[PDB]
Amino acid sequence: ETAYFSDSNGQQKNRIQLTNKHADVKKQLKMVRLGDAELYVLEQLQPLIQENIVNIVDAFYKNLDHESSLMDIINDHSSVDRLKQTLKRHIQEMFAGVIDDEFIEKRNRIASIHLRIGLLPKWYMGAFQELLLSMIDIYEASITNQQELLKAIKATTKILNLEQQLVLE
Amino acid sequence: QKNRIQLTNKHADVKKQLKMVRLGDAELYVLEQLQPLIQENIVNIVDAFYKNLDHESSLMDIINDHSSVDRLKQTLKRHIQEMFAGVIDDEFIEKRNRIASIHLRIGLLPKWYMGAFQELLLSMIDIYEASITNQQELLKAIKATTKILNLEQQLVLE
Ligand code: HEM
Ligand code: HEM
Ligand SMILES: [C-]#N
Ligand SMILES: [C-]#N
Numbered sequence: 001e002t003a004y005f006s007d008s009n010g011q012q013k014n015r016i017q018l019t020n021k022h023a024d025v026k027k028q029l030k031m032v033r034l035g036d037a038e039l040y041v042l043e044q045l046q047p048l049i050q051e052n053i054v055n056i057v058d059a060f061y062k063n064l065d066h067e068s069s070l071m072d073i074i075n076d077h078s079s080v081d082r083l084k085q086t087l088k089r090h091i092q093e094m095f096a097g098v099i100d101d102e103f104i105e106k107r108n109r110i111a112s113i114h115l116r117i118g119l120l121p122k123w124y125m126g127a128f129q130e131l132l133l134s135m136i137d138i139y140e141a142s143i144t145n146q147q148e149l150l151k152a153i154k155a156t157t158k159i160l161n162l163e164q165q166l167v168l169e
Numbered sequence: 170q171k172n173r174i175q176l177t178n179k180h181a182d183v184k185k186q187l188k189m190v191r192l193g194d195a196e197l198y199v200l201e202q203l204q205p206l207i208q209e210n211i212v213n214i215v216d217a218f219y220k221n222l223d224h225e226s227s228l229m230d231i232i233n234d235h236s237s238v239d240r241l242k243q244t245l246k247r248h249i250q251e252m253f254a255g256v257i258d259d260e261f262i263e264k265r266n267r268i269a270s271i272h273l274r275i276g277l278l279p280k281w282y283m284g285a286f287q288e289l290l291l292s293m294i295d296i297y298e299a300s301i302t303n304q305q306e307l308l309k310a311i312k313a314t315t316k317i318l319n320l321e322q323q324l325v326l327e
Contacts, residue, residue: 027225028280032287066189121326122186129190129319136312146304153311154294161287165280168326 004148005044012040017100025104028165034099034158041155043097048138053091056134057084063130070123077117091131094159107166114167121169128160170194173201175258183262186323192257192316199313201255206300207293208250214292215242215249221288228281235275249289252317265324272325282325286318 015036018026029035049056061080064070074080090110093103114124139152173194176184187193207214219238222228232241248268251261272282293314301307 024280028284031221031224031284033291063189066185122182122323123189125323125326126186126189126319129316132315133191133312136308140308146307149304150294150298154291157287157290157294157315161283164322165283168279168283 001145004143004145005041005151008040012036015039015043015098017098018104019101022101022104025099028162029099032158032161034162038155038158039097039099041151042095042159045139045152045155046092046095046097048142049095049135050092052134052138053088056091056131056138057087059134060087060127060130064123064127067123070119073117073119094163099162104166107163111167124167125164128164132156132160170198173197173256175256176262177259180259180262183257183324186320187257190316190319190323192320196313196316197255197257199309200253200317203297203310203313204250204253204255206296207253210292210296211246211250214289214296215245217292218242218245218285218288222285225281228277231275231277252321257320262324265321266327269325269327279326283322286322290314290318 013036016026016029016039061074061084064074074083093106096103135156136153139149139156143149143152171194174184174187174197219242222232229238232238251264254261294311297307297310297314301310
């Protein structure tokens with residue numbers, strides 16, 4: 001049969017570039033078992049994710065109007081239409097297959113931003129779940145090997161958990 | 170699935186929170202359905218949890234300052250099993266809250282708290298892959314499990 005993933009170990013090295021500024025982050029990646037192999041997997045999903053980001057962002061803002069105050073927050077500072085563009089690029093930065101200082105530093109920046117505008121952490125956390133769900137949905141439609149499917153899901157739960165760790169608290 | 174979510178107006182936001190992770194009756198029924206699977210591997214799930222913590226010396230230090238891994242696996246076994254009870258009520262929420270506050274008083278960092286939930290998920294996804302053949306039921310169980318663990322992080326972060 002055909003496979004979705006390449007297993008090219010030549011291809012999956014050096015995907016963690018962290019200095020001592022980010023000395024805890026290397027521990028954190030080790031605990032969620034985020035490594036070269038998982039990052040290479042992330043990198044190969046990026047096309048799927050890219051091809052589907054518009055559905056992923058639409059679904060995300062749609063979910064948020066379950067809580068009117070989250071929408072007030074958005075409309076006080078911006079608009080959905082304009083947050084989508086930046087969410088597209090953030091989501092896609094998750095599937096780049098490299099964790100480095102800049103990656104971290106950008107995550108700390110968006111954290112501070114949500115802190116400022118008053119997002120409460122439980123809505124922040126809840127919001128990552130529509131992402132997960134839309135991704136799983138994209139995987140299933142496109143990855144019909146059951147074993148490769150699980151592999152895409154596990155990698156994804158890993159990168160999302162690191163995302164949540166970065167923004168908290 | 171019956172009437173598995175039984176919250177009073179003091180937990181108004183939690184209701185919204187549930188709707189937003191799509192944790193309703195169907196998903197709770199699924200978790201209930203998974204409970205026997207989960208109970209039959211709880212010892213190993215919890216062995217793996219603490220094993221994984223040992224990679225961060227400061228986490229085990231907090232644990233040994235306050236308690237111990239042997240006493241801690243008894244409450245964790247029970248906590249995880251209650252996760253698949255298939256019912257969310259005021260007391261379920263209320264315990265998660267008290268358990269949270271213990272962790273802030275002991276000085277557990279929320280990054281670490283957060284990573285810790287991934288470990289459980291992984292052990293859980295491992296069991297379902299070994300145990301549930303049909304791909305759709307398999308996705309259904311991971312999705313459910315994923316919802317409840319997200320709730321659990323929300324309530325801790327409250
Ligand atoms: C997984 C969840 C989320 C991610 C990854 C995320 C990410 C981002 C990013 C990358 C930006 C930067 C935009 C810029 O450059 O100005 C941003 C902006 C913003 N986000 Fe989020 N966001 C998330 C959830 C939320 C939620 C739940 C709300 C709703 C309250 C929210 C409200 C905002 C607002 C209002 C801004 C700033 C607008 C401005 O002043 O320009 N975010 N978010
Ligand atoms: C998925 C994450 C976690 C869950 C679900 C969890 C759950 C629990 C539960 C149910 C209790 C007992 C509360 C009670 O007495 O009612 C407990 C105890 C405790 N947990 Fe956690 N825990 C988690 C992560 C952690 C981590 C990562 C650490 C530190 C390495 C930690 C340290 C402790 C300690 C030291 C206590 C209190 C012992 C005492 O004061 O006697 N927990 N946890
Ligand atoms: C933040 N969109
Ligand atoms: C908390 N083990």
